[PDB]
Amino acid sequence: DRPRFSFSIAAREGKARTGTIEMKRGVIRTPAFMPVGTAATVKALKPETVRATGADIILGNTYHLMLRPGAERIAKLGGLHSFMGWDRPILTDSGGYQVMSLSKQSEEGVTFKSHGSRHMLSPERSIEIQHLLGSDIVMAFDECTPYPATPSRAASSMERSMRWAKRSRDAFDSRKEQAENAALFGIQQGSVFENLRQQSADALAEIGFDGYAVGGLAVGEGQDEMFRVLDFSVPMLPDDKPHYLMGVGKPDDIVGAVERGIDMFDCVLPTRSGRNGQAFTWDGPINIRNARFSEDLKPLDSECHCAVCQKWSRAYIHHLIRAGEILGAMLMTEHNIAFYQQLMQKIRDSISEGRFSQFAQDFRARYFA
Amino acid sequence: DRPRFSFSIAAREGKARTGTIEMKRGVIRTPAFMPVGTAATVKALKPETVRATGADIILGNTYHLMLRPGAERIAKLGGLHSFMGWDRPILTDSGGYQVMSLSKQSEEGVTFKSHGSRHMLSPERSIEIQHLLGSDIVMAFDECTPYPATPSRAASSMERSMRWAKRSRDAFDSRKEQAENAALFGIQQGSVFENLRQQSADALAEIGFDGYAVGGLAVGEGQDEMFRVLDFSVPMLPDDKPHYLMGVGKPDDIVGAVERGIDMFDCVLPTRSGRNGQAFTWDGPINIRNARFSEDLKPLDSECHCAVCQKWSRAYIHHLIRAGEILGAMLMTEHNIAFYQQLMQKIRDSISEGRFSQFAQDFRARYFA
Ligand SMILES: [Cl-]
Ligand SMILES: [Cl-]
Ligand SMILES: [Zn+2]
Ligand SMILES: [Zn+2]
């Protein structure tokens, strides 16, 4: 009854869009934020809590899960959805970034040492691992180069990534169960160079994908440069397909990226920085460990609708985090993920109502005040 | 409308009793197990989850809370119940054991260094701290001696504890809000010596308390010796008041202690050992980290009614705990506390039905098989 993958744009304002991706396991409202669930858990949250915050889809990692607990093992246990208890869509990263980030490169693929066993990844093996996991949105396997990259290392990694994108496409299409029930996204590369981004976009559009990610950003280029690259890169992608900015980001990063045509986001910031004591508020981030919160009976944020802000004070959460208590990480993480989802809802509503430009201005004025 | 403290025994079988303690913040079904909430949290659980497992009352610690976040601070923030979000009864230990365990003794009290500021505790100060916390069941402040104690160190600590019990009684009665809304328990001491236990029981009964704890056990004496001391010590206490065995214990410890007349228990074992990978089952404890569980799709326990066993496999929880994931600690802890509460429910039902002797035999035969 439900479709494999149907993206519908309900409203536009400038370059920003809002709409839905319908998939067999559920609907994804866009612009969407995906909580990161690296090792088959969104850290410190039950899946029901992740859903309660408003998340429609989570992200899992091919590289981590292939090492622990193992992709064939997860398949034997019934797939990633059943294993971790999340029955809605899951997007899996292909492994390319973490192989470079955490762990021998050739045209066939890459061999590497686990962060210390030896493992192989290729476009075909990445697609097969994501099939074994049961991913709903499969990412093409690419080759990343560190930042800052020379123009030579940018062009060579990009063209190989495009050759690997065609191999990923073919491996995915060769697996009937995958091609009938999942979607495949290609990844635009080319670093900060407009002509390479164009060559990458053209190659991916020639192959044909369900969605297009902007890769190679959120690697330490600063917000000004990221926005500058998004300015020319997103219009190169097919307008009628979703645009996914990998690894981004801070709340203001997300707002500016939506203003430039991005529909999907993932980032560890709300979870990781929550465990570290950083809470997001409409008046900017706060560090709850600061002594100024020790007797503050207000919730983390005065407008937030999350269950944490309905029940517990800053003072209590300050105590938990300073004491190293697990409940501190749980409450900070639930609030931060809920805050991110409320940001996405405000973005979606304001685009639908044709007042997203004003929302972005009002958001920034208060958030950086 | 609700009474300050009303203990009713609904059924008996041998020395075992089952019934209720009615208090202003709720009813406590006995025999009762109290999850330990040391630093104003039952580790890795929201209070709603603690309640969902069946807990009627939790335990907090005078010694830890007076150091962090501070008793006057908690009172300024509205009391411990409001601070941590648990609106049901709270029993607070008086500080005597942790002062000895974790941190200069005289007849007036004890001075000590925090585990490194300097602090004072006396019967009057302990009662006042528990008043500031808003405890529902206040423990008399006593002087503990390490195990194994000589007969001289046992008698001297006990008689001082009895002098301190009268001072605790007087300080409690002097505080109208405390005396009208909370209860006060005295602590029997005397180590493994029958005559000292009798002198202690007589002194406490002369003073008069709402309930009577058996102190000085669960300090490394083994189950045989603990049971031997309970055999003669519990009958010395007033029959018409609750009997509280502090710091106990393993499931078989609890069953045997109920067989000897104990009504209330607290222990860190289900929480602490849950975080460490030990799950309690009706077939005995298992360590979920063991490789034998890596592909085991069964729940932690085949009969357990808890939400963890309804949803997740041993294999998943094995992965979480081996990966150091917070959700592993959350799920193990919820299951273990739920298992303890189901044990207490089975104990209560079997005493009510006059088949507790058979339950204890059936429990032990299966648990140690
Ligand atoms: Cl994270
Ligand atoms: Cl604990
Ligand atoms: Zn909130
Ligand atoms: Zn269970």
UniProtKB/Swiss-Prot annotation, chains A, B:
Substrate binds at residues 93-97, 142, 189, 216. GO terms for molecular function: metal ion binding; tRNA-guanosine(34) queuine transglycosylase activity. SUPFAM superfamilies: tRNA-guanine transglycosylase. It is an enzyme of class 2 (transferase). Changing residue 94 to A: Strongly reduces activity. Disulfide bonds: none annotated. The keyword Cell division does not apply. Its cofactor is Zn(2+). Binds 1 zinc ion per subunit. Keywords: Glycosyltransferase, Metal-binding, Queuosine biosynthesis, Transferase, tRNA processing, Zinc. It comes from the Bacteria. The active site is at 93 (proton acceptor), 266 (nucleophile). Changing residue 266 to N: Abolishes catalytic activity. GO terms for biological process: queuosine biosynthetic process; tRNA wobble guanine modification; tRNA-guanine transglycosylation. Residues 247-253, 271-275 are annotated as: RNA binding. It catalyses: 7-aminomethyl-7-carbaguanine + guanosine(34) in tRNA = 7-aminomethyl-7-carbaguanosine(34) in tRNA + guanine. Pathway: tRNA modification; tRNA-queuosine biosynthesis. Its EC number is 2.4.2.29. Zn(2+) binds at residues 304, 306, 309, 335. Belongs to the queuine tRNA-ribosyltransferase family. Homodimer. Within each dimer, one monomer is responsible for RNA recognition and catalysis, while the other monomer binds to the replacement base PreQ1. Catalyzes the base-exchange of a guanine (G) residue with the queuine precursor 7-aminomethyl-7-deazaguanine (PreQ1) at position 34 (anticodon wobble position) in tRNAs with GU(N) anticodons (tRNA-Asp, -Asn, -His and -Tyr). Catalysis occurs through a double-displacement mechanism. The nucleophile active site attacks the C1' of nucleotide 34 to detach the guanine base from the RNA, forming a covalent enzyme-RNA intermediate. The proton acceptor active site deprotonates the incoming PreQ1, allowing a nucleophilic attack on the C1' of the ribose to form the product. This is Queuine tRNA-ribosyltransferase.
